[PDB]
Design a protein around this nucleic acid. Structure first.
Ligand SMILES: CN[C@@H]1[C@@H](O)[C@@H](O[C@@H]2[C@@H](O)[C@H](O[C@H]3O[C@H]([C@@H](C)O)[C@@H](O)[C@H](O)[C@H]3N)[C@@H](N)C[C@H]2N)OC[C@]1(C)O
Lengths: 192, 98, 61, 171, 51, 106, 199
RNA sequence: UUGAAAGGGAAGGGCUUGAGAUCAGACUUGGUACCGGGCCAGCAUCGGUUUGGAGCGGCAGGAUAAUGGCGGAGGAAUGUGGCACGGCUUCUGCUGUGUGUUAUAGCCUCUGACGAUACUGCCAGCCUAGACCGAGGACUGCGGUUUUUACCUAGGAUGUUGGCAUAAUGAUCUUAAGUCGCCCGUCUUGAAACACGGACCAAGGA
RNA sequence: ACCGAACGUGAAGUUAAAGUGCCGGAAUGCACGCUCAUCAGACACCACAAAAGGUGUUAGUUCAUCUAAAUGAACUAGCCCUGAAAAUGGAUGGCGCUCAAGCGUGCUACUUAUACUUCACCGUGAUUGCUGUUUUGACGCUUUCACGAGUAGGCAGGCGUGGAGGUCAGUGACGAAGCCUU
């Protein structure tokens, strides 16, 4: 909690100091995306079909966390007309994990109802609690691979309030697919 | 969980008895009941045993006395209590204050 | 729906019991199922799977 | 309310040849910041031979109206594409904000020329400060001394389906 | 046998996150930030308005 | 007096339905004098009675009731959805129902 | 919006189709409706255009036997009835029962000449059409396509209006007298106390 | 033939409910006036899921909102007062045109110090209206409160009250209403087909 | 064969594509314009229209003439009109609709799929544990998770018929078998 507060305030101070010193502060690029599949399972060309499989997005309204790199960015690029993604806030991650967080324990979807379940499977990566897991996801940490893969793909509902009139076109052209970049949080509140 | 009510039995014809809060509309008209003694009415008082026990009639007279002492202070309150409520044409309970 | 990444409802493809109806072979399977369940010696598990094998998979020694 | 005015500032990514590449700014009318940065890169890729992947967005900022409750007249210069060709045009609008005038312009070009949002470039939006600058009679007629006009034939909106009294349109 | 939502169930919230007691006790969710009043844009940053 | 009513008048309008498929388990009800979802939310949870007459006496009476309750609002014009112990028969499309004032929260 | 026993609509100045849709939904929902003065209905568009439309309607007839074809009714109330029946599922029992709740008339026959008539603002021509747009009166259109009783209805309506005006003069005199009597009893205790209640 | 029922250019079917008929069940293998149970419901509280309110409040950001209000300087016109020229008003909003810069109205630009609001986000803040569900069946776990080898909202519904058992209740059959429903088998890229076999029933039939 | 979405049996919630004047669940909802047709127009695939004209109306472009009260030329592209003729009577699906219920565009809410979310139940596959309590079913019992469309075709587990060995010291003239029957 303390380091979340100090990171927010330090960025605010930097943005203010840049204005005074006749400079422009540029934020660090986002390191994390949350990707939601919003297309059904029929009539998908093979390459994006394989990409969606490799992202563990095999149903509609499934969601996973992804660490942004050139490799994964080009992966998501291939899945763009079938997913909505953006940069999750800390509270979005917390709410997703608390309400719809499940672990893969011996190939089984197991509810994260106790810290023992997390410590037994990820404690060897020094994750002892649900807050440790949330911290590891939000700050794209050293054991992000193991923590993200231990989480079962999030199984969201349809949005309370619906999508835009037509989904399957980019967020920029008034649809619902692609990178919407901070409005992923409003969509998760609708669907979670 | 029930409510203890009286007519008073003289004004309305309805005695001391229990009613359920969900089957009542609570209006904004109030009677000062600091002067009524209701310290001996409880669930056991309506335990099941026409003919009415002299206990119940005596209690009804006693409570009616204090209530009528207090009800007469508000003009038209006794006549209002004597009259039955009904919904007229154009009466919308979502718009109506009680 | 689901975009399945593997065939659904596939049986394990391994024999889990002797096809035989010899009651004494079943007694041996019972003993070695207990042994493989309660002892965690690898040998007992190997013996248990061997008791399931068909004739051509148990060549004479 | 459909739109906001943004400044978007970007530059080329620094290299060894050019440690301090030149900052560029655009005034963009967009529904949100995602579209604003998209439009910035669209115009930078037209005007200059740059791409999004070899550049970066430096700042995105709302530009609020200076006097939101002062009545103004705006001239807007536009480039739009028709079914048949590409045209320049200049139109005038009355409003209290630049965003209101731009929204009205988008409605007007949709209505009279069937020009969708994707077909229009906003060259320039200028608050016309002298009444002599107002060129179009469809806005000029609201700039006359002691303008007053009635609103004949008022239609009252009814809550009920059946009215017990005859209609009136007085006002 | 039954999953309980910690954002709804206070007890399950405390079971998963002991710190939720201190977060509420210290009013972290509504903490005043102590600072002064400055306008770092009163100069060149006012090229936001016009060039 | 001469008016004794304690219920609000209503009508059985329809079942929940799409264009071609109806759902008899949910009825759409028009409450008199209610024109918006805001007004209709006063009646959520109120009990509904459909009172009808039948040829044969039961307990010396020819009056029979189907009980239900208001569950949620429907649309933008103040209609509500209702759930009855037994689905209202479709011949009662256009018939009147009785919206009680209980369970009361006033 | 209230449930009435019978709603009697004065058809004068109402647009055909808008009134028809409103009435159709009313009768489907269990409300009895009577529409009077159907010859005073309106249709948007100039007269000649609606006459052309009716003649295109007349052109449709069963080839092998004209007696089986569409039956083209000419009276204005039947023109409104055709508009309404097209908005009803009239081939079902429920649709038939809905149509039984409807009555339509030229003029204002008894007993509806002594009953209150209402209007439907969502369908009123003076409230809907743009002020310069041309419109048709259904009574003229009916007479142009074979309706035979325009002049009879006009004569009877004149007689009804004479009687109704005399009725109204009496009611106005009575109301004036009653207003004087209520003015004589103002500033009373009851009058002041009612005034404190908004009445 | 008898009885019952339905019937506006086919009939027949599914789903749902009503109506009429039939069937069934706990006052139990009940126990000894009492105990206790069965069924149908009302209310209360809890747990799970979920939709709401004109919701209320705290905090953060931004141009440390922009405005506005207040103070200061500068300016002009769709030029107020004043003044002059007039065609019409017995200057009975008369009126119009000119002039110039607050006058007997005001406006615009820039700016100084305070104070808000909008928008966006956060609260492990508060209050409040409804709906559906109640799987499991000694205990065992994790936590909490601690005032306790205790108690809890924390490993899945209990409490209470009324009615009924000559029945409120459930199933089936017949029929009405609403909605949907082309004739099967076959060859075929494609069958309701203006493609073929099939009037009906039994027994035989690969 | 398009769009959406692929299907065990259910409850509640939310949606996709498509819609919300009536037929039909959902607004005669909020908003800026455009259009009047004596063959208007009305939603992808898709149930067609061209070259070419208009002083109908709207908005634009570039020139020019005017107090030494605005006007003149050329042009651009929106909706509308002409170009636009077939045989039974007839199809924006119908009604009908004209500051639309039409065309372009923005917004708010709302409607409902066998799809998504939570829960119940069936089955399939996997999975946890079970012998000093293994207890006459260990081919059994038990914990947990995921999944379920299907012609040709494969396999599994069952239902039914004639006759044969064994068993129930089985049923039966006090009524076997057959047949009819809310
Ligand atoms: C905007 N593009 C238009 C397209 O909309 C359409 O135009 C129709 C035009 O064909 C119609 O006009 C045409 O068709 C009608 C009728 C047969 O529909 C005839 O009566 C008329 O004579 C004929 N010119 C006109 N009444 C409306 C336009 N939108 O046809 C193609 C087009 C001309 O390019």
């Amino acid at each position: 909690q303390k380091e979340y507060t100090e990171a927010e305030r330090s960025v605010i101070k930097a943005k203010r100091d840049a204005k005074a010193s006749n400079s422009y502060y540029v934020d660090a690029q986002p390191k994390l995306v949350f990707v939601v599949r919003i297309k059904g399972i029929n009539k998908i060309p093979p390459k994006p079909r394989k990409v969606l499989q490799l992202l563990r997005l095999t149903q509609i309204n499934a969601g996973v966390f992804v660490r942004l790199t050139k490799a994964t960015s080009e992966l998501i690029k291939l899945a763009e007309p079938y997913v909505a993604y953006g940069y999750p806030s800390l509270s979005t991650i917390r709410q997703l994990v608390y309400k719809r967080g499940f672990g893969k324990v011996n190939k089984q979807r197991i509810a994260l109802s106790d810290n023992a379940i997390i410590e037994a499977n990820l404690g060897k990566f020094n994750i002892l609690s649900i807050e440790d897991l949330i911290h590891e996801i939000y700050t794209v940490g050293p054991n992000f691979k193991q923590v993200s893969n231990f989480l079962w793909p999030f199984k969201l509902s349809n949005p309370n309030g619906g999508f835009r009139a037509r989904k399957f076109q980019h967020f920029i052209q008034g649809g619902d697919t692609g990178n919407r970049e901070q409005f992923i949080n409003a969509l998760v509140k609708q669907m979670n | 969980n029930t409510l203890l009510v009286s007519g008073p039995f003289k004004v309305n014809g309805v005695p001391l008895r229990r009613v359920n809060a969900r089957y009542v509309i609570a209006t904004s008209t109030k009677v000062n009941v600091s002067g009524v003694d209701v310290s001996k009415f409880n669930v056991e008082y309506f335990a099941r045993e026409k003919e009415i026990k002299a206990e119940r009639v005596a209690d009804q007279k006693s409570v009616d006395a204090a209530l009528l002492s207090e009800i007469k202070k508000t003009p038209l309150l006794k006549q209002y209590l004597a009259a039955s409520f009904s919904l007229k044409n154009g009466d919308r309970p979502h718009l109506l204050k009680f | 729906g689901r975009d399945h990444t593997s065939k659904q409802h596939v049986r394990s493809g391994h024999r889990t019991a002797p096809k035989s109806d010899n009651v004494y072979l079943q007694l041996l399977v019972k003993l070695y199922s207990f042994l493989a369940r309660r002892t965690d010696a690898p040998f007992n598990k190997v013996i248990l799977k061997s008791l399931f094998l068909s004739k051509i998979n148990r060549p004479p020694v | 309310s459909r739109l906001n005015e943004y400044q978007v500032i970007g530059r080329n990514l620094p290299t060894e040849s050019v440690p301090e590449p030149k900052l560029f700014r655009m005034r963009i009318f967009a529904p949100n910041t995602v579209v604003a940065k998209s439009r910035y890169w669209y115009f930078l890729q037209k005007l200059h031979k740059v791409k999004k992947a070899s550049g970066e967005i430096v700042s995105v900022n709302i530009i609020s109206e200076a006097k939101p409750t002062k009545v103004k007249t705006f001239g807007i210069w536009l480039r739009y594409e028709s079914r048949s060709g590409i045209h320049n045009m200049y139109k005038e609008y009355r409003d209290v904000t630049r965003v209101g005038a731009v929204e009205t312009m988008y409605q007007d070009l949709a209505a009279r020329h069937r020009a969708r949002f994707r077909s229009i470039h906003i060259l320039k939006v200028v608050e016309l400060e002298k009444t002599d600058d107002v060129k179009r009679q469809y806005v000029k007629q609201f700039l006359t001394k002691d303008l007053k006009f009635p609103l004949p034939h008022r239609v009252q909106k009814s809550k009920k389906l059946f009215q017990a009294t005859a209609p009136t349109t007085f006002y | 046998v039954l999953k309980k939502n910690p954002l709804k169930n206070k007890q399950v919230l405390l079971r998963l996150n002991p710190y939720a007691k201190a977060y509420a006790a210290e009013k972290v969710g509504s903490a005043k930030v102590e600072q002064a009043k400055v306008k770092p844009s009163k100069g060149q940053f006012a090229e936001v308005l016009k060039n | 007096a001469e008016s004794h009513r304690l219920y609000v008048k209503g009508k059985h309008i329809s079942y929940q339905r799409s264009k071609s498929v109806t759902n008899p388990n949910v009825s759409l009800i028009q409450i008199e004098g209610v024109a918006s979802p805001k007004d209709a939310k006063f009646y959520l949870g109120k009990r509904i009675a459909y009172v009808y007459r039948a040829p044969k006496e039961i307990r010396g009476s020819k009056i029979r009731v189907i009980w239900g309750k208001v569950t949620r609002t429907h649309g933008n014009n103040g209609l509500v959805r209702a759930n009855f112990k037994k689905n209202l028969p479709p011949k009662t499309f256009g018939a009147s129902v009785r919206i009680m004032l209980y369970p009361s929260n006033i | 919006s209230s449930f009435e026993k019978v709603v009697v609509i004065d058809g004068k100045g109402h647009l055909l189709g808008r009134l028809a849709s409103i009435v159709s939904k009313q009768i489907l929902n269990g409300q009895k409706v009577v529409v009077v003065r159907c010859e005073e209905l309106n249709i948007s568009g100039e007269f000649f255009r609606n006459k052309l439309k009716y003649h295109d309607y007349l052109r449709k007839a069963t080839r092998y036997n004209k007696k089986k074809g569409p039956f083209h009714f000419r009276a204005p109330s039947r023109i409104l009835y055709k508009a309404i029946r097209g908005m009803i599922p009239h081939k079902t029992a429920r649709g038939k029962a809905a149509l039984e709740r409807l009555k339509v008339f030229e003029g204002v026959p008894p007993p509806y000449d002594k009953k209150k008539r209402v209007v439907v603002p969502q369908a009123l021509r003076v409230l809907r059409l743009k002020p310069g747009r041309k419109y048709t009166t259904v009574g003229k259109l009916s007479s142009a396509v074979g309706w035979k009783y325009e002049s009879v209805v006009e004569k009877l309506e004149e007689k009804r209006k004479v009687q109704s005006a005399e009725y109204y003069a009496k009611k106005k005199a009575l109301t004036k007298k009653l207003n004087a009597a209520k003015a004589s009893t103002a500033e009373s205790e009851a009058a002041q106390k009612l005034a404190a209640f908004g009445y």
